[PDB]
Amino acid sequence: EDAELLVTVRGGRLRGIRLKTPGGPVSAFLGIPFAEPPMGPRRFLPPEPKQPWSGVVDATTFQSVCYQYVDTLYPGFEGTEMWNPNRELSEDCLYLNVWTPYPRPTSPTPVLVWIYGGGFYSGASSLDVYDGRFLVQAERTVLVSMNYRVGAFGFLALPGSREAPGNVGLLDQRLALQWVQENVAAFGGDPTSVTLFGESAGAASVGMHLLSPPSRGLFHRAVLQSGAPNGPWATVGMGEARRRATQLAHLVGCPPGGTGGNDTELVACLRTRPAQVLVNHEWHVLPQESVFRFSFVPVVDGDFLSDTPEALINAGDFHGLQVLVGVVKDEGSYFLVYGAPGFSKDNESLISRAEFLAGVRVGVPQVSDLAAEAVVLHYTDWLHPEDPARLREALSDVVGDHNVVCPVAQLAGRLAAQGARVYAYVFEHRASTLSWPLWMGVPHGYEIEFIFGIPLDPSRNYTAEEKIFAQRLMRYWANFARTGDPNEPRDPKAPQWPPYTAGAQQYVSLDLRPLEVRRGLRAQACAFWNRFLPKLLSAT
Amino acid sequence: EDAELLVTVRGGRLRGIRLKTPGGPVSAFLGIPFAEPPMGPRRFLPPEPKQPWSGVVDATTFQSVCYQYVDTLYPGFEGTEMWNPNRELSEDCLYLNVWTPYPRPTSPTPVLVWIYGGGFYSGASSLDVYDGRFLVQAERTVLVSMNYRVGAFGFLALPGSREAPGNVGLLDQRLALQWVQENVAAFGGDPTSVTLFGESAGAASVGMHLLSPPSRGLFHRAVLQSGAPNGPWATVGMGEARRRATQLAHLVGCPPGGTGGNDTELVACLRTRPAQVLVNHEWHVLPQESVFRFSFVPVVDGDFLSDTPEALINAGDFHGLQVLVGVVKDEGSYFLVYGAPGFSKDNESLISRAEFLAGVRVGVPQVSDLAAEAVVLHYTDWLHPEDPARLREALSDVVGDHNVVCPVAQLAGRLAAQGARVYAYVFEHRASTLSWPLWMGVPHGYEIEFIFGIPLDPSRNYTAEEKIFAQRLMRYWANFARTGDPNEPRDPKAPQWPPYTAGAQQYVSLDLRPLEVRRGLRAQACAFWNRFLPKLLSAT
Ligand SMILES: O/N=C/c1cc[n+](C[n+]2ccc(/C=N/O)cc2)cc1
Ligand SMILES: O/N=C/c1cc[n+](C[n+]2ccc(/C=N/O)cc2)cc1
């Protein structure tokens, strides 16, 4: 009862709240501080553990959202606003959340840890679609989600210097993982059965923790949904990270009046600026020329990542690891309305031939003029080279394959061939309540509703089939968190989910129909990006 | 007492509210409906007069703001968000407001009518800087301000057709002027002493009412602040208006695939779309390539404007008309931040020369390469052709002269030479509470707060000299409204404000110093725009 809404951790006491689901109650502890607020002289610095507190911290509501750009492409639109901050912005934002079943588990229960997406420039654990009350009630697992610094506050990097080392947003997530190790037992969770799962930039973070030794010891399984650390958008070099950080300082007036520009006086000048000022100039340090290119992302400093993600994946030993990777059916359609010519969510987006040739440039940026042509060859149907509907879905594939599906398949194949046990999926159900246009199909990020059991919310108009479907998906994710295998341990009735190996390359389709095994995560198209295109780009 | 907060007009009864100033109370009637709500089948149509109502309409708060794009360039910034809507958005927005002194004037009192600016795409009568409580208390005049439809809802035009005739936003203002003729007497106002005053697009609107015979009979004086109808941004051709309206229909899916659209089926399709959907695609109608160019502006159809504003100003007879025109000192700096390269309000905007040549293309669009060169070579100081600070002020003058100062001076000269009595000013005081950077000087729109006596608000950190300066400014505007002459009727000791003539070209400087007469509203620069540039543009 209300006695179970009181919990003591290594820092102090907490009072949680009881959440209601149609199948029973859940105990939530929203707003637990896990780090000292990274404000003032602590801006751009690695997080420090929260010092113990006196009294009872209130943990009945979500805390502040980290300072971030707010999307204004379609004001008043549910499809874009559902990802916007739903609490007020503040640099004081390093807080995590723990859901636990009622009654509290008496035996150590596996823990799922969620990491949010949003290009490393946005995101919050308080979004309605990340509500863990349905996943915890239905599968009796422990769910943990943290906030990490995004944008410049999380990933502005002057490499080498100690005032702005970079990747502090990744260190925020790591500290929250150390917090789970030291404190999840008090909530009934098993610190030896921790399964990370993220989406988009969250999946890239999950993968970047696999490739970082200090973070690897803090978890045991990984789930990467529509994202991977080896993506062309998920990392940046040291020289470019220095250029962008210096450019942002110039846009806000640093250094002032022509004084010195060494990294000490530059960061000190950046620390005196209001947080909103830095955010208001985030998308200027890029040419734009940018969908799918974000200003401040993890850098290859040599610290958090001793080498590039692709190098660490190719040389990695992954025995004893279980991974669940997957993508949605139409990864790239969500990103076309952000600058691809001829595209608009309010019409059919029937683009011309010339608009397709220009859209390849914003979808695949920083590419040579001849390499952009090989993309047009590979994705043009030459029996219908002018059909606008086919060109629309072609550019969607160009952007989806280059940025998500093929970086994921490249990672999934290397893991299975080097000791890891890998399961792959492709989410193919379009929600009956989706506000995006029909031509986008299953857009990026719209499998999250069903993983978190949001259809079970009685205040939402989901179908009865989507409720059974969401419950089936939650069992898949929970079974993987418990046993490292999405298949039910004692049920041969349901169709089986075979592992993904580098040879057969088997995956299953996730929709209202029973499971169906297929071969190849866009095997033909991804050979163009993973195998041929580097050979062509290196010939200069 | 409270009996004066009750007034009957030709439509019904109203209950006003009493506003407080540090020098006495004011009776305000905010939210008076003057037209039937232009919703449903009445979208894009000329306004119909409000039907009489039963009971007492509440007139104690501002009504809704007309649907308009919300500026998001600098979120959380006072300088931009002070012009953003401060009431809920609705197509039901045709309401006006009346301020009147306490006690109510017993004899007919002159009436000032305010028309807000905002490039015909934004603006509202409810903004705090348009609060008429200080002008009415200090000068005992009657102040009226209306809302008019902006953007596509006010100025989308398929010329010729009757489903979308265009200029309905100008007809909104005219209906409010006919309302003042029929009802301002009930508030103590003189319908024979009505003085229009607007700013930016409001000043452009005031000028278009001078050039429209039906609107000319509803007022007797005019004040044009930082705007004129003959500006390169205030009008559009019939062919471009049709191209712009058709483009907006395509962006929202009109007409549906498999259907052709005449002017009827196209507007019928546009009338079924939510208002926010039309707003979300307003800026895609033009290339952008756009500061200083707005999608939906008054069209030259032959109806409201029998010819272009330039033609009607030249052939116009203006005897018996008093006009007060003026500009601010730095008309162009506010708009550079909206697209000129190298410009940022948070640094010094010390642009290179390459950025200067590029900025001329954005500030002066739609001109040939030879024409752009003549602008660069005319505005370059050749002893310092690379000084960034001089290039910044140069580009500020380039867009300030081309869009505001020279259209005003061109208009002011033609009026004084064809019968009108004209007074000119240049506002040269930068408010002590201004949130824009110092290098913007006196930006566009920041004389309004002194005309409306906002410094008198005791909850604002204005200086004592600005309070005296604000009171002195309101007297000029009130004296012009009463007598058609800003000079004090019987105060010969104060410096005099001589009329503006086409030859002497005299104006006064408005700042904390007493009046100083000067000659030439940028006479050398405006000769380049008004006299030579048309001749050079006759060369393809
Ligand atoms: O006129 N300015 C338009 C404009 C629009 C959007 N942004 C920010 N932005 C860019 C890309 C993406 C990609 N998301 O997948 C998200 C957000 C800046 C400026
Ligand atoms: O995410 N969208 C950003 C964005 C959308 C549309 N514009 C066009 N625009 C031009 C001029 C002005 C004001 N001029 O004074 C206001 C707006 C710019 C940026």
For chain B, give every domain's residue range: 2-334+401-524
Is there a contact between A284 and B257 if contact means CB atoms under 8 Å apart? no
Using alpha carbons, select from B365, B303, B294 the residue that is nearest to residue B152: B294
Residues B139, B163, B282, B331: which is the catalytic one?
Answer: B331
CA distance B294 to B151: 9
What phi and psi, each to the nearest 5 degrees, are found at residue B143?
A: -110, 130
CA distance A377 to A384: 13
b/e string for A383-394 if b means 16 or more Cβ within 10 A?
A: eeeeebebbbbb
CA distance A200 to A206: 10
Using CA atoms in the order B369, B370, B371, B377, what is the torsion angle rounded to 10 degrees?
110
Closest ligand by atom to B399 CA: 2
Spell out which residues line ligand 1, taking CB within 6 angstroms: A 283, 290-291, 335, 338
Q: What is the DSSP letter of A35?
A: B
Give the number of other CB atoms < 10 A from CB of residue A539. 9
Pair B24, B90: CB distance under 8 Å: no
Q: What is the DSSP letter of A279?
A: H
CA distance B97 to A438: 45
- In chain B, the largest separation of any two C-alpha atoms, in whole Å, equals 76
3-state secondary structure B197-212: EEECHHHHHHHHHHCC
Is there a contact between A251 and B70 if contact means CB atoms under 8 Å apart? no
Using CA atoms in the order B252, B258, B260, B261, what is the torsion angle rounded to 10 degrees?
-20
Q: What is the DSSP letter of A60?
A: B
Within 8 A by CB and 6+ apart from A414, the residues are: A313, A314, A316, A502
Is there a contact between B251 and A346 if contact means CB atoms under 8 Å apart? yes
b/e string for B308-335 if b means 16 or more Cβ within 10 A?
A: ebbebbeebebeebbbbbbbbbbbbbbb
Pair A401, A426: CB distance under 8 Å: no
Spell out which residues line ligand 2, taking CB within 6 angstroms: A 72-73; B 283, 290-291, 335, 338
What phi and psi, each to the nearest 5 degrees, are found at residue A435?
A: -90, -15
Chain interruptions in chain A, by residue before each (C–N > 2.5 Å): none
Chain A residues within 8 angstroms (CB to CB) of chain B: 70, 72, 74-77, 250-253, 273, 276-277, 279-281, 284, 344, 346-348, 350
Is residue A241 classed as helix, strand or coil in its secondary structure?
helix
Got the DSSP string for B232-260?
A: TTS-B-HHHHHHHHHHHHHHTT-SPTT--
- Return the ∠ at Cα B90 (arms to B88 and B91), rounded to 5°: 160
Alpha helices in A108-237 (DSSP H): 133-139, 151-155, 168-183, 201-210, 213-216
How remote is the CA of residue B458 from the centroid of ligand 2, in Å? 34
What residue in A sits closest to B250 (Cα-Cα)? Answer: A347
Residue from A248, A259, A280, A338 to probe the interface with B (highest B Cβ count within 10 Å): A280
What phi and psi, each to the nearest 5 degrees, are found at residue A518?
A: -140, 170
Structure determined via: X-ray
CA distance A446 to A428: 10
Handedness of CA A133, A139, A140, A142 (dihedral sign): negative
Question: Which H/E stretch holds residue A467?
Answer: helix A464-483
How remote is the CA of residue B245 from the centroid of ligand 1, in Å? 25
Q: What is the DSSP letter of A155?
A: H
User: Is A220 marked as binding a ligand?
Assistant: no
Is there a contact between A74 and B280 if contact means CB atoms under 8 Å apart? yes
- Say how many residues make up chain B: 540
Q: Residue A427's beta-bridge partner residues? A: A328, A510
- A298 residue type, one letter: P
User: Is B95 marked as binding a ligand?
Assistant: no
Using alpha carbons, select from A46, A84, A44, A59 the residue that is nearest to residue A8: A59
What six digits make up the tokens of A403?
């940025």
- A306 residue type, one letter: S
CA distance B281 to B250: 10
CA distance B405 to B105: 38
What six digits make up the tokens of B44?
């894009």
Closest ligand by atom to B340 CA: 2
How remote is the CA of residue B288 from the centroid of ligand 2, in Å? 9
Got the DSSP string for A399-438?
A: HHIIIIIHHHHHHHHHHHHTT-EEEEEEE-PPPTT--S-G
Pair A452, A131: CB distance under 8 Å: yes
What phi and psi, each to the nearest 5 degrees, are found at residue A192?
A: -105, 5
Using alpha carbons, select from A180, A192, A121 the residue that is nearest to residue A146: A180
Class of CATH domain A2-334+401-524: alpha beta
Pair B356, B376: CB distance under 8 Å: yes
Task: For ligand 2, pick from A71, A72, A84, A281 the residue to mutate: most ligand atoms within 8 Å of CB.
Answer: A72
Phi-psi region of A274 (alpha: psi -120 to 50; beta: other; left: phi over 0): beta
Q: How far is CA B102 from CA A232, A257, B13, B23, B138, in A?
A: 68, 53, 19, 11, 11
